[PDB]
Amino acid sequence: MAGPCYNPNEHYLPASFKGVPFDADSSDSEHGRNGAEAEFVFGERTGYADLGIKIRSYSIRARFQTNDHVALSNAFIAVLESTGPGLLVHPTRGPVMAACRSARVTDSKVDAAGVTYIDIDFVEANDTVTGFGLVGSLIALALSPIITATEESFKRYYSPENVRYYNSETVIATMAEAVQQVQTGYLALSGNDTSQEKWTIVRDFRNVLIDEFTFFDPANSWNVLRNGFSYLDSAAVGQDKFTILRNIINWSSSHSELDGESADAQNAIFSAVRVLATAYLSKAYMETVASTVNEGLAQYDQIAAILEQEAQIAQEDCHDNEFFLSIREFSVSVARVMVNRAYNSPALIVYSFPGTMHSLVVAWEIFGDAKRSRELEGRNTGAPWAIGPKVIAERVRA
């Protein structure tokens, strides 16, 4: 060191292991990083790739000089052999968790009597769970719970065979209209498809609607409704479904004007359809990149309002307590993902330039590659030659 005012007792921590103090005499360590260097044949260029961090390792040396060193030395060995890892206070690296890997005890009776040395070889050991990793998933929604919840609510009230006879015709007619809405949606999405499956699906839709008895069974009615959306959702991926789903939600905002039971048998069709459409609309939003934080959060508010309205209806007069709980839990789940997408999908941040500059120049300055200017087109208004003076771009993660 520099200067004559050093105080080694003040800069080196006192060693220890599992709580038992001991006198340290040396301190080493080993760090690094795992590479995958590769060299081709006949080539004048090489490559590299990173594969992760390398496991550390520490080595220490201890001296025992005090009276009756054999007892302290012999008693300390009984700690290194104790099962499991424990806290280690490295003299310079601070407190870390390690497990002893070996230890050589040296001693003599004539060459050196009265001092015992012991070398050690520690290894970093971080605790791990026993299920080889139960990390959670935060990249997709869970639609199975809500869909099953909706099924129970719909089946509870929709029953055309028990409602008063002079209202069965109207209730059934409404259901036929509800399916037709899905039929129109599907036909619009797959306009340019010509595979052999489209003909089969179209035939299936026509057959069910022509038959008059298919909707007398609640089991048949639900299955057609659930499957219809399944084909609708898989018809296209991305923004293509925004308009189609929004229209269906609009149609399912009506409320029945009959009385007593007949009203419940009809509100069930409307309420069930809207919840399904909202759930699938959320899935569609998860398949597109958030243009901006403000826009991404605006989309989320559009969904929370619809789910909140449905929750109030189901809890208006304890109409369906279980349904109210299911909707409430699903809404918070949607928020956990929609908010994350808006704030963290590309991780946008606002920059503060000193004046308007071209898109090409802005891209090169922020990142270092003018070819990335294409990204800035969708997030910033203004002509390509007058972007600024405040820009929205990604976070550099060098």
């Binding site: 003040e10 709580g19 901006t292 920059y351 300055e365």
Partner: protein, 175 residues
């Protein structure tokens, strides 16, 4: 839309001298706490200024888990916080600057206190509120000792390009 897109808000923040200063023959010291702001017709509200400074006070003025000793502690005052069982960042709340013991001359003990202070306040960088922190200590004699803590902040909107490090996350508190 309007350039003010950042919708993140700021909750309550502990502040120094919120409840005044308690005086004594030895000296005068502050009594930190929450602050109340009053409108013209009642309707009191809490203050939410100096987020990072308020966060530092929480870290310093809270006992962390005590190290095992072999004789044991009473269950009441083992230290720490029971809510740390749920956090997933692999850290523990509070601080342990108060768990020092008189070792050697006073100069050595003061040096150890500084080491603990740096170790605990280092958690600020990990959370991402601050990009660097450092504490300077000066020993003048028997009864007069001083500490100064420097915390570096950043503006809300980026202005520089080509930084060696990284833009600290959670900078929307802009401090």
């Amino acid at each position: 839309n309007f350039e003010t897109a950042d919708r993140r808000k700021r909750f309550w923040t502990t502040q120094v001298a919120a409840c005044g200063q308690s005086s004594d023959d030895c000296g005068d010291c502050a009594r930190p706490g929450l602050q109340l702001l009053c409108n013209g017709e009642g309707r009191i509200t809490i203050a939410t200024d100096n987020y990072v400074a308020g966060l530092a006070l929480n870290i310093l003025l809270t006992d962390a888990s005590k190290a095992d000793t072999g004789c044991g502690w009473t269950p009441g005052n083992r230290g720490g916080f029971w809510g740390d069982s749920f956090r997933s960042d692999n850290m523990r709340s509070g601080s342990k600057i108060r768990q020092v013991t008189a070792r050697g001359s006073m100069r050595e003990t003061v040096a150890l206190i500084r080491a603990y202070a740096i170790d605990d306040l280092k958690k600020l960088v990990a959370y991402g509120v601050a990009k660097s922190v450092d504490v300077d200590l000066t020993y003048q004699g028997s009864n007069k000792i001083d500490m100064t803590i420097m915390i570096q902040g950043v503006d809300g909107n980026e202005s520089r390009v080509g930084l060696t490090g990284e833009r600290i996350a959670n900078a929307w508190v802009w401090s």
